[PDB]
Amino acid sequence: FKAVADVEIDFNNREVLKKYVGIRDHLSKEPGTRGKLIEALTEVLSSIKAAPEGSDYRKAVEASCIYRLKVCKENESDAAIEEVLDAHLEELIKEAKEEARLVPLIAGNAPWDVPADYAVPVVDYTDAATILDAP
């Protein structure tokens, strides 16, 4: 991207860029580290235990947390985690905190309580080029 100021900014030092994009001011003054993300993921995994084991929502959240933890384990440099996850560590910290906070309301409402013969009508859209262009 392009910096707006008339001055030259290196931007190769990651903290300088973090200052420029105002993460320090608007999102997190504190620099996010791998350990904080690990703590957040562990908290989410602890928090999701309020859901029944038979719920697929718990299953999906657990799978996401397991993948994120594997990413954190196999990666040492935080910039590597940024490259893998296409964001910054502070963003991931906010994501994990948000996902943990989502749990109590879902537990209080429990969307999984549906009859065994619950029916979901599904409609799919098919393009005309499917039968018109070269197979």
């Binding site: 707006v4 100021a5 008339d6 001055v7 900014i9 300088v16 200052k19 420029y20 320090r24 001011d25």
Partner: protein, 199 residues
Amino acid sequence: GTERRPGESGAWKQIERQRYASDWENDPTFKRTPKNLAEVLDDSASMLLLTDVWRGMAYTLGAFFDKKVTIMYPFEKGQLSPRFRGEHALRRYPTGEERCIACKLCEAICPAQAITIEAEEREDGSRRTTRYDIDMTKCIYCGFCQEACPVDAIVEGPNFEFSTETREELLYDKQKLLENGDKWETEIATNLRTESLYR
């Protein structure tokens, strides 16, 4: 320049923050602190003695001795193109017969509902209009009528200076439209001789 300074912030939260926290120093977009007598004198020359107003002043003053783009209407006019959509008009054939054949495509296409058409067969068997009215106070000059007509009957002429003192004068009938077409035919035909390569 685009750099920022302490005290030049236009707020209170930010001003109170910078005079009681060095957070602006961590920001690279803020001009860094002077470190010697030379840099202090440079900063003083920046703040005092203006030196920022002076440049814009000089540029405006050069603009004073500069040329202008002003035109002397009505003795001078602007630049326009044949595609210009102006006053609607009715066209004829060179023998003198009306081009409009009351196919009512123009009325059908007009989203302004500003066209009122009545027609019947003429005494010679010709299919001609009996009432052809377009409300200029209601016409939006979109030119969609000029696009729809397949005989080049209705055209938006190059006339654009046709303001009237009363609103009633703009209730264009068949007769005034034909008058306008007979007046402006040559210019419209010349423009069509160009627009034909695109239309």
